[PDB]
Amino acid sequence: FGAISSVLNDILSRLDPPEAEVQIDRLITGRLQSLQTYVTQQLIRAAE
Amino acid sequence: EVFNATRFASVYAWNRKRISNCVADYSVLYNSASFSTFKCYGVSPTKLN
Amino acid sequence: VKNKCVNFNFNGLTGTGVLTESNKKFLPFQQFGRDIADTTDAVRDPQTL
């Protein structure tokens, strides 16, 4: 999702919080959007 | 042999040395006052150890 | 230490989980393995292979 790595442990163990915050925020945004999409699809299928 | 050497190559002919098969202590390098510039990109220096 | 949930730092690869003996076998060039979902599931001990 634009971050340096897709694993939170790598970012935590490689970067200090002040600069790792941006990568963690990008990962959070991407994963939150994916989860919201999944929940919406599940709601529609549950209605079906 | 790289930091405490006596010869440094020119800028357009910069000298590259490969480091492998050993253990590196970056903490002593970072905490020393001999260096007037120590900046790390993609990693933080304090975690290099 | 095996059969206990611990933090493991396997050759720079950090994580948390339970280490157990594996019936799975690695070819003698592979270091770690991934699941169908690409989550790490196996590792090779740097000191015991």
Swiss-Prot record, chain C:
Top-level taxon of the source organism: Viruses
Subunit structure: Binds to host ACE2. RBD also interacts with the N-linked glycan on 'Asn-90' of ACE2. Cleavage of S generates a polybasic C-terminal sequence on S1 that binds to host Neuropilin-1 (NRP1) and Neuropilin-2 (NRP2) receptors. Interacts with host integrin alpha-5/beta-1 (ITGA5:ITGB1) and with ACE2 in complex with integrin alpha-5/beta-1 (ITGA5:ITGB1). May interact via cytoplasmic c-terminus with M protein. May interact (via N-terminus) with host bilirubin and biliverdin, thereby preventing antibody binding to the SARS-CoV-2 spike NTD via an allosteric mechanism.
Functional note: Attaches the virion to the cell membrane by interacting with host receptor, initiating the infection. The major receptor is host ACE2. When S2/S2' has been cleaved, binding to the receptor triggers direct fusion at the cell membrane. When S2/S2' has not been cleaved, binding to the receptor results in internalization of the virus by endocytosis using host TFRC and GRM2 and leading to fusion of the virion membrane with the host endosomal membrane. Alternatively, may use NRP1/NRP2 and integrin as entry receptors.
Designated name of the protein: Spike protein S1
Biological source species: Severe acute respiratory syndrome coronavirus 2 (2019-nCoV)
Gene name tied to this protein: S
